[PDB]
Amino acid sequence: NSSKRDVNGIYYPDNDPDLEGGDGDGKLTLGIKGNPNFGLVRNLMVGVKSRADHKDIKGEVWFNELRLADLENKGGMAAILNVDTNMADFATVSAT
Amino acid sequence: TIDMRSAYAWSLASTPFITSINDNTFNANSNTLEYGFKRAKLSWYTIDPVFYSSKPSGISNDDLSLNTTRRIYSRELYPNTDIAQGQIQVVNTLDLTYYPGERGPYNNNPSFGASNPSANFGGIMRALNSTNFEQGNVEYIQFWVLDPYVGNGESPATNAGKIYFNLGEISEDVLKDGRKQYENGLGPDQVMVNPQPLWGDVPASQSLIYAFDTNPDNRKNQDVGLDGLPSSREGSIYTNYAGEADPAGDDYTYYLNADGGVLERYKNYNGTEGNSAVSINDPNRGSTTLPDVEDINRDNTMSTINAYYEYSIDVKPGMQVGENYITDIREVTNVDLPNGGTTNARWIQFKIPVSQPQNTIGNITDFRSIRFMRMFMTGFNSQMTVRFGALDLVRGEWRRYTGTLDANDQNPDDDGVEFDVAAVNIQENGTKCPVNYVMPPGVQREQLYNNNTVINQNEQALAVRIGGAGLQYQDSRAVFKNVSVDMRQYKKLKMFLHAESLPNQPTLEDDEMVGFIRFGNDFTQNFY
Amino acid sequence: SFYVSVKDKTIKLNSTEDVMREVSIFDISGKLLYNNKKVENTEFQVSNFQSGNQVLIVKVTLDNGNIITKKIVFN
Amino acid sequence: RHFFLSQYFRNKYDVSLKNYPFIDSRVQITRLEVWVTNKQNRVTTTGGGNNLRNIIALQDLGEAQVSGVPDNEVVVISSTAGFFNNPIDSPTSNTNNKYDPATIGQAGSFLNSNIREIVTAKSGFNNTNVSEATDYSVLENARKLTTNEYTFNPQLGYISLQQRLANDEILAVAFEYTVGGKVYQVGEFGSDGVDATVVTGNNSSNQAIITQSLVLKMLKSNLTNVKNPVWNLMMKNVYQIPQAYQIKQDDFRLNILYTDPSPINYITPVQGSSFPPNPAPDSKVEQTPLLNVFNLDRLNYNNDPQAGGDGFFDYIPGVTVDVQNGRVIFTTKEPFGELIFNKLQTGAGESYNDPTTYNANQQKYVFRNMYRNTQAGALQDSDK
Amino acid sequence: LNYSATSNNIVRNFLNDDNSPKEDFNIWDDYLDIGTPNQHAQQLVLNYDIPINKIPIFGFVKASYSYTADYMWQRSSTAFSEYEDPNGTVYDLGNTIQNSNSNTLTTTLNMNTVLTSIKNVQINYTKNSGTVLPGYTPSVGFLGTSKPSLGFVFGSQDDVRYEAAKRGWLTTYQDFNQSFTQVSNKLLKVTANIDLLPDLKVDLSMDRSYSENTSEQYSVDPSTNEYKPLSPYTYGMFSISTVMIKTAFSPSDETQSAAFDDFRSNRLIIANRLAEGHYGSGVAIPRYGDANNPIPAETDPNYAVYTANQGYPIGYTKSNQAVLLPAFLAAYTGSD
Amino acid sequence: DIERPITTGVPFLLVAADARAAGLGDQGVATSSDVFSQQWNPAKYAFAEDAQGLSISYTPYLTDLANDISLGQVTYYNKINDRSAFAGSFRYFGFGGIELRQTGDPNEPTREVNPNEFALDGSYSLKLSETFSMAVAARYIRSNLKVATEEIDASAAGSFAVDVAGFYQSEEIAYSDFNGRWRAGFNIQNLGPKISYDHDDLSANFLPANLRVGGGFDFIFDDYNKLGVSLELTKLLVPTPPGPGTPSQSQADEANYKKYKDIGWVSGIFKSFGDAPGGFSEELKEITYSAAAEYMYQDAFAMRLGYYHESPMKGAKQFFSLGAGFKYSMIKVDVSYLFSASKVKNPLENTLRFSLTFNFGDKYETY
Amino acid sequence: INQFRSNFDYNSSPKVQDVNTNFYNEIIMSNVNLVEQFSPLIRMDFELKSSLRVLSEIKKDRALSMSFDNNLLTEVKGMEYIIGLGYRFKDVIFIIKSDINIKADFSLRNNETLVRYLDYDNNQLAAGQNIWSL
Ligand SMILES: CCCCCCCCCCC(CCCCCCCCCC)(CO[C@H]1O[C@@H](CO)[C@H](O[C@@H]2O[C@@H](CO)[C@H](O)[C@@H](O)[C@@H]2O)[C@@H](O)[C@@H]1O)CO[C@H]1O[C@@H](CO)[C@H](O[C@@H]2O[C@@H](CO)[C@H](O)[C@@H](O)[C@@H]2O)[C@@H](O)[C@H]1O
């Protein structure tokens, strides 16, 4: 319900007067509404909005090569320890 | 794409309504023979390769260099498309030759030669395999067509006209009487409707299989056309032309059994009487083995509903990109011809958005059941040949988002904003009039091996066009996709964007249009 | 017992008492042209423009890991 | 793929399954004939015989009124004045309204003998506003489905086709069922319907052929209209478990979660609001597992009722699970629509068919559009 | 004689008086506690070689009999056994019992050891049966039951519905929606061998299959405890070996068929015979063109039907199944 | 990647059709004389050690995807004298039988089509000197890869070509550590009129005219161990099509393609050479090369390594090749495998080529 | 009879005639099938002392199926002629001597599907096959 959101409920850090640096990108405007998750994106939208106040703008926009880049290729480690003992055909222990 | 330029799939159309179900422009509401009074002659075909490879007697090299008869190669229409060696290198265009001054089949107009040719129509229709346009996301009708006012056999500039497309439920009653004609049920020993139904003989029995037998006598008695009359009793019905050898104008002629040029030989190739000769060695060779039936989607039922959308295309000498649904024009400067000469040519690409019909006829509200497709030419003064180098229904994987995106607007289905989504290719839009399509810097065409041949893959971008009234200050138009993508293992999301102004429109300025990506679990509650 | 039919640029699979899980359609170049993981013995509409290519390869994965291969001509 | 046989069965579904596995209904579907659009056009003596008939399927055949449902979404007929001739909640039957094929053109019927012919089918109606694809549909060589091409629930009155009708195909049925000692029929079978052909005369020059159509109940029309009641006959509470054919109990687990964005097995109220206070134990939403919210967990392992369920999906081979085909059926016809709407209702001012009256908890949890629209159309409601 | 029995009981010690689970219940609480019966199955398989070779008059028979009987009792859910109507009355809707029979008889019947040409007459007769009775209120014991009838537990197939209703151990609910069901299957596979001539080998075969399923709903009258069947119905399948070689070599094409002409002509003969069977010769058989049944006006709904079969008996037209099925069979088997 | 590849008709003529040459990096112009020496250098058929030989070669395509799609070769050679030889080879690329089926009562009769592409050639080789030989070959090529439909004509396209080959093989020469042998070879291939796939003179494709020049050396140790090192260079004799522009945007490209396609094959052979403002280095990008090493034990076991390099500007066919060969009594079996080193997917990857030759008749001594 | 069943319309009510003025039948079925097979109609299998073996056979079948739903008769008629010839030329010389085993297999299959109306002459040809092979 904060006034820092738009009439659509989107929060724009660039429009936040109490935030230094905005959204951290000088070229793009970033907004967020309701806890999305880019670890599982179910809905993808590309579109055109207007910024001309007293105008009706027309034109064509091409979108190309929507892609992910800069793979996080840090590795990982694993370690396994196995202790298998048998006691004179009476007992067997196997620890992992 | 779904290809629609198969000539054998098209059949003679019923008389169309033009603006509404209450419009008798072509006498579509008439319950008499007048229903067929405005039908002019139309031939639809694909020129047989025998005309180009082994020239038949009476066909010269001049007959094969006209821009209406010449063989079209893929490298002319698609200069950037790689074809593997030994595969199909020619484009098999769908040719529609329209004679507005000549009588169409089953036309009994007493005064047809004194009527205005531009008031006539010539039409064909077709069944659609997939009928749910919404589920399939059928976005537009795309066709590449040769400009008929440029080439060697160019039409006079005064011969301008219109091509109409109808999508939806279109009546299958070609000869409107409420009865389904099927000529495999005709014959002297068969029961007919006791009072003749105004066009000729209709079998009284219920049809079972749309097939002839192989008895030549039965074939002669059965393959008599959609009117059910063997050209000897047609004068009783078609009284204004009883003195002619073919009163109904439905006789079939094989294109190798005719004389003249290529166009003249296909003039009667679509006649329904005599087009199913039993023997393939007949001088009047068949061109089909199926009986002519007033049931086009082959569900045994003749539909009579007329609820469909109308789209229209102007055909004028000097059309340009940006109007008349034109998206691209490719000019061909020096076409080599079999007669040793050269000619100019112009290919025009039309993209008619299905979601924006020009008119509605009858009671159709959505695109969930689109069963029939019709196209008819009208308004032309003289003979006009239209060659579809491509004719497809194009469906997209990106769906237009309907419903408001900004709460300020609160009026989604209004404001008259034309919002279109299509694609721009390197293989089809390298000569696009405002901006030729090129790949973004660093982007290369993928290369594969078809059969010891290097094939460059197509490079495509998604094009969104905003026109008409235009976009309000904070309004937006978007397309969307249902995906399942994990981005957590990558650091950057990247995209190429391009902006251009529409032709014949006020120029778009910098930082007026904003390109946005909205991604998440939905577009209204949880998104970046 | 398996049949693939093409009437008008539409592919139609027919299996007698065998239910398919996946279908893949490849070109002669080896490029994957179509893939569906939710086969229901139904029809398939592949893009009609294939740049002069007619021969296609249909690979069908059934309930078990058995794979049925059929060469068809796209008409 | 799944269709209720009549609006009567569709409106009886929810109430009849309140105390499952007990079914509060005595309907026993005994006979069923199913006709579809014939595109194969193949005549064989082995595939159940060559039974090709002309069919006219009426949307409103056999329908009576319903107590809590207005007539405008039970039948498509423009005016119901004089249409019905049985009490309101009567079970579906040929005699329920004036479309009764047994009374065609007697004294006050809405149909003439012209209804029997395909050529004069439209003129076979005595009313004015009748459309060729809304009130009825016609087929000329409709093929009867064999018993291996469909199954049906004999108690709940719905059918499941082997092949789905994702296209313009027409579905028509005739069925006969019993309630105790009473027998009801809704369509025309081949044994009690009019003859296919009647011939008058002796030779082909003077012979007249009359091909007569069977009158059936329409379940799917030629043209899709989601606003017509026939659209509601298509079931949207059946889910096909992928790749599953012969699922059995002790080898099947199912849970319902809310993923916004993480999977959580309960539902929380919108900020600044709360769930309805003091609910019935069968309508709890606050701190309730979603299996109980959607009426899928009220029994224990032995399918005996338990206070708040046992935490596991109720596996009833005739009610909640279709064993032979690996399908799961909810106990309500619209679980994610009207059921959760009713569990979230706080007052009589909220109406399920009027989305403008939702109480802001129904505004985020009720997926009405997945039942009132097609799936592609429901794609536009992304947040539901 | 092989006998087998299986029994599954459920332990419900963790439940309260109402359907509320006990939170503080351990898995070892009453471990050696047999619960109430939930499912009980019995199977009996008896095989007999029938040593009829004792007498030297029937020493060529090699008969063999197999009898399999299956019985099942299934407890219904508490939603059925303790069903409460909106009126507040509590009804016991009972449990379910099922029965199955698998009679089988195989005889070799060596004709050895013009009729002497027969060598072997192999006869196979299979008879399956089944009975499902729902609404059966009583339970079963530890070792089984004989409560409906001892024969039923071993697949008698004799009727027990009326006896069960009289004994009072069917459900008293008057809107019971579960159907009493019966199924029967008969298969006969006679085979004979003939050697009329020294190098003439002849094999004869006869097959007959008949399957029948009956279903009905029921109630029990609150007084006198009498069983009321409701809407009983039957369906099934039939198949039998036949001979129609008499019409096998008659030409039959799209222009001529003698057998089909016989089919057309036999309809009136069959209809007349059926009319004599219905109207028993004491009155003139009413027909569609006579004075009492005149051809109606052209606008009458039955004008075409009356004109189509003018001389046929009133209830037996050309389209009657009872008329044209025997006509079809007689025409294509060559019978009169 | 591949900038301006050379477009030729019937490219299947350029595919190696035997496992022995495939295992040696697709080169045979200067290798030892064998039964497969017809695609590479017919002139060494006069240097054969056996009088007559037959051979069957199988090269499968898309092994994982489908069966019966393969390039087969059958070769026969007969050297009559000690100086001359005749040979005949047949290469056949096929997809196998394909059934054309509509549902239509699936018991209905169906039409089977076999789209294919074959070449049949015959060569005569004659020894001029004791160390040099020449050969002339004539080849007929037919292409029937199209399937007849409506508005599609599936008439086969045919052409003829000639081959001029030369092969030099020295005698055994003793050196300090081994007594090796020298070999050289050239082969001008596929010289013939353009093939018209659409049966129109205006739309015709150049035959894949090729030039192979190679040389090899045999290290012979212990009389039981041999190591043959061979190097081959190949140049297509077809003019390169115009590229981005060679000074109205598409008009210039259209005119350039018009002038390129109106070039005779005879004139195109010479136009392939030069046509660049630069020198030899700029033209070296149109030269493919291959280097092969074949170890031979007792003339009965063969182990082959090969490297084939095209310039990535055209074609992009760069790979290593492994090969093995065995000789039991008169039957020789060759197997070859390919490891691709190019960005573009090689159609012969993960593919085992098979070859099988029978040798019979008299035996000839080697000078 | 693939499926017969009892009729609820066959009851104790005074209503005895249906919409076609026919009396109600106690047992109703949709189809009846009469299937006949000569498999083979005649098979002559012999061999000459000259190693000439002939296996000839004629097979026949009829598949009458009458439908009461439309009262139509569907007749499927099939005939098959098979001839198998086997011979062995002995000691055929190309120094190289071998026997020549010659086998010939001729087949001729005719199949026809007819739909017959009972009240007028409307015999419809629905399907057919006229194949021969050697
Ligand atoms: C029509 C079309 C082709 C059919 C022609 C068949 C000819 C078969 C030739 C067999 C071959 C290559 C076989 C490998 C190629 C197969 C590849 C198949 C791949 C399929 C995917 C070696 O095969 C040898 O195998 C030996 C077994 O160890 C046998 O030795 C035999 O054992 C005893 C007999 O029992 C004998 O006493 C003994 O003397 C043999 O030594 C013989 O079978 C043969 O010599 C050829 O080598 C040699 O065969 C001889 C004739 O034998 C050929 O002489 C000529 O033949 C005809 C000329 O045409 C003329 O008539 C003939 O006058 C003339 O003398 C020569 O060519 C010669 O060079």
Side-chain angles (χ1 to χ4, degrees), chain D residues 25-26 180 195 303-305 307, chain E residues 12 19 77-78 176-177 231 319:
Chain D
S25 151
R26 219 190 183 170
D195 289 318
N303 285 332
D304 300 301
Chain E
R12 292 163 53 97
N19 301 328
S77 138
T78 278
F176 198 45
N177 61 0
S231 301
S319 70

Side-chain angles (χ1 to χ4, degrees), chain F residues 52 54 56 330 358 360-361, chain G residues 94-96:
Chain F
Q52 308 164 49
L54 193 82
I56 324 280
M330 77 141 180
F358 311 82
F360 42 97
Chain G
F94 205 42
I95 182 55
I96 297 197

Side-chain angles (χ1 to χ4, degrees), chain D residues 30-31 43 45 48-53 144 176 183 190-197 199 207 209, chain G residues 5 8-9 19-20 28 30-31 33 63 65 67-71 74 76 113 115 117 119-120 126:
Chain D
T30 66
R31 208 174 153 198
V43 186
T45 58
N50 173 26
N51 315 293
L52 291 185
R53 288 295 307 265
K144 196 159 83 165
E176 186 186 57
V183 180
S191 34
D192 63 77
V194 291
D195 289 318
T197 153
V199 176
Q207 261 164 350
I209 319 292
Chain G
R5 52 172 58 242
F8 277 132
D9 292 333
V19 72
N20 300 315
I28 50 151
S30 292
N31 304 93
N33 283 95
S65 178
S67 178
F68 311 104
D69 287 344
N70 51 32
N71 284 341
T74 307
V76 178
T113 294
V115 176
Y117 288 71
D119 254 19
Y120 73 119

Side-chain angles (χ1 to χ4, degrees), chain G residues 15 18 24 29 49 56 59 78 84:
Chain G
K15 182 192 212 296
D18 50 44
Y24 286 119
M29 81 278 320
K49 291 235 187 54
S56 190
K59 298 190 269 158

Side-chain angles (χ1 to χ4, degrees), chain C residues 1 15-19:
Chain C
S1 157
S15 64
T16 318
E17 267 94 37
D18 255 338
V19 47

Side-chain angles (χ1 to χ4, degrees), chain C residues 21-48:
Chain C
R21 172 207 326 163
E22 208 215 74
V23 66
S24 268
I25 292 140
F26 297 85
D27 230 337
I28 281 312
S29 81
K31 163 174 64 153
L32 178 69
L33 289 188
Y34 169 94
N35 172 255
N36 192 21
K37 271 118 161 135
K38 337 191 113 133
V39 181
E40 329 141 352
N41 262 272
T42 183
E43 294 215 293
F44 305 95
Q45 257 194 335
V46 190
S47 198
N48 281 202

Side-chain angles (χ1 to χ4, degrees), chain A residues 47-63:
Chain A
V48 288
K49 213 215 285 199
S50 171
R51 269 173 14 79
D53 312 36
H54 317 282
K55 253 166 109 143
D56 275 302
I57 60 165
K58 293 159 238 199
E60 206 172 296
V61 168
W62 296 347
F63 306 83

Side-chain angles (χ1 to χ4, degrees), chain F residues 105-326:
Chain F
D105 187 28
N107 200 238
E108 100 292 29
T110 37
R111 179 180 25 132
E112 170 135 285
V113 298
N114 56 328
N116 67 90
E117 223 167 14
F118 70 85
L120 172 76
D121 45 23
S123 70
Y124 173 76
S125 61
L126 175 69
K127 230 181 281 206
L128 305 187
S129 99
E130 208 57 76
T131 50
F132 187 67
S133 173
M134 287 213 85
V136 278
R139 175 174 304 110
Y140 168 71
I141 311 115
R142 195 179 234 243
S143 190
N144 219 346
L145 292 171
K146 306 203 253 275
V147 179
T149 77
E150 301 93 350
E151 59 267 327
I152 284 181
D153 156 72
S155 288
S159 210
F160 288 93
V162 287
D163 278 274
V164 181
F167 181 70
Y168 162 81
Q169 169 159 292
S170 86
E171 82 287 346
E172 203 165 332
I173 297 152
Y175 298 100
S176 325
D177 309 274
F178 40 82
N179 44 354
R181 188 192 298 269
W182 289 101
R183 262 168 208 123
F186 71 91
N187 192 9
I188 315 150
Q189 287 198 305
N190 310 315
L191 313 172
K194 301 211 217 174
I195 171 149
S196 211
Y197 288 111
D198 297 293
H199 323 279
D200 155 45
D201 279 87
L202 294 182
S203 178
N205 285 99
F206 287 102
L207 291 189
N210 204 44
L211 170 65
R212 309 175 174 283
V213 169
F217 182 79
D218 262 5
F219 305 86
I220 297 143
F221 358 77
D222 295 289
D223 163 49
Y224 279 176
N225 287 292
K226 225 165 44 170
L227 183 58
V229 166
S230 211
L231 174 87
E232 186 164 309
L233 308 175
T234 268
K235 187 195 167 43
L236 267 189
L237 302 177
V238 177
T240 303
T246 325
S248 63
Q249 256 67 56
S250 42
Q251 256 182 3
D253 286 336
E254 199 173 359
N256 280 332
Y257 203 90
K258 163 95 174 94
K259 85 190 307 273
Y260 156 78
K261 99 190 199 263
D262 290 332
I263 292 180
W265 67 274
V266 176
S267 118
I269 283 162
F270 315 110
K271 279 225 188 38
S272 49
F273 297 109
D275 75 84
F280 191 44
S281 291
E282 306 272 21
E283 211 168 357
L284 268 206
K285 213 84 212 157
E286 287 287 358
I287 308 300
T288 87
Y289 57 88
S290 47
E294 184 182 61
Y295 165 74
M296 264 276 272
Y297 178 66
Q298 270 185 64
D299 291 303
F301 173 62
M303 180 75 222
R304 321 184 164 104
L305 300 179
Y307 176 69
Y308 182 91
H309 183 263
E310 256 170 14
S311 79
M313 272 255 274
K314 44 134 271 173
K317 246 166 181 33
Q318 297 79 228
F319 59 89
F320 294 87
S321 56
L322 261 165
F326 308 90

